[PDB]
Design an enzyme around this catalytic site. Sequence first.
Site, PDB file in Angstrom:
ATOM      1  N   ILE A  13       0.855  -1.197   0.000  1.00  0.00           N
ATOM      2  CA  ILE A  13       0.000   0.000   0.000  1.00  0.00           C
ATOM      3  C   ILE A  13       0.882   1.235   0.000  1.00  0.00           C
ATOM      4  O   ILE A  13       1.619   1.471   0.950  1.00  0.00           O
ATOM      5  CB  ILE A  13      -0.948   0.035   1.196  1.00  0.00           C
ATOM      6  CG1 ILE A  13      -1.839  -1.212   1.202  1.00  0.00           C
ATOM      7  CG2 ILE A  13      -1.783   1.320   1.142  1.00  0.00           C
ATOM      8  CD1 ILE A  13      -2.789  -1.335   2.422  1.00  0.00           C
ATOM      9  N   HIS A  14       0.825   2.009  -1.077  1.00  0.00           N
ATOM     10  CA  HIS A  14       1.684   3.173  -1.199  1.00  0.00           C
ATOM     11  C   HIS A  14       1.004   4.374  -1.816  1.00  0.00           C
ATOM     12  O   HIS A  14       1.136   4.646  -2.999  1.00  0.00           O
ATOM     13  CB  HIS A  14       2.979   2.832  -1.940  1.00  0.00           C
ATOM     14  CG  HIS A  14       2.789   2.188  -3.282  1.00  0.00           C
ATOM     15  ND1 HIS A  14       3.071   2.844  -4.459  1.00  0.00           N
ATOM     16  CD2 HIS A  14       2.428   0.925  -3.632  1.00  0.00           C
ATOM     17  CE1 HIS A  14       2.898   2.017  -5.477  1.00  0.00           C
ATOM     18  NE2 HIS A  14       2.497   0.850  -5.005  1.00  0.00           N
ATOM     19  N   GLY A  15       0.250   5.078  -0.995  1.00  0.00           N
ATOM     20  CA  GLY A  15      -0.344   6.331  -1.414  1.00  0.00           C
ATOM     21  C   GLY A  15      -1.368   6.227  -2.522  1.00  0.00           C
ATOM     22  O   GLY A  15      -2.049   5.210  -2.677  1.00  0.00           O
TER      23      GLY A  15
END
Length: 163
Positions: A13-15
């Site tokens: 999960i990255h932005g």
Amino acid sequence: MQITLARIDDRLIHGQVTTVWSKVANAQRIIICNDDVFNDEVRRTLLRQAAPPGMKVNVVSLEKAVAVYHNPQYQDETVFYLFTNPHDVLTMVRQGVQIATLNIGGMAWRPGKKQLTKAVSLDPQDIQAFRELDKLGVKLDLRVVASDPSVNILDKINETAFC
């Protein structure tokens, strides 16, 4: 469980990027399937705190991913799977987890890997896993972002290597 998106992205999960994908998936639960991530309390905490509004996030071992998949309590639950590598997808598929198409979004470069294209680097073991996935009928959908043109990762590999 109904799998609406299964994605290899080792940044998990990255932005904004993951958020956008989460809306494409329209799932109730994002499930990170990985034995080692489960064991890092700081990373697990960052992942749980990164849950998009209205969605749950769980970080589980492959064993538990398969177990909960087979639990009728979650029969109709919609799920967005996150993986760090194709070997783990293969392991779960061999255990009855029905993944019709696998999205490949990010496989980071490290010594021992050879870059294939932007965002995807591989070693022979990775490539073999993809070949086994394809033999099982899994569609291979390489796109970093949803709006990108889909590339068949095996066809891409096969452009410059035999098999």
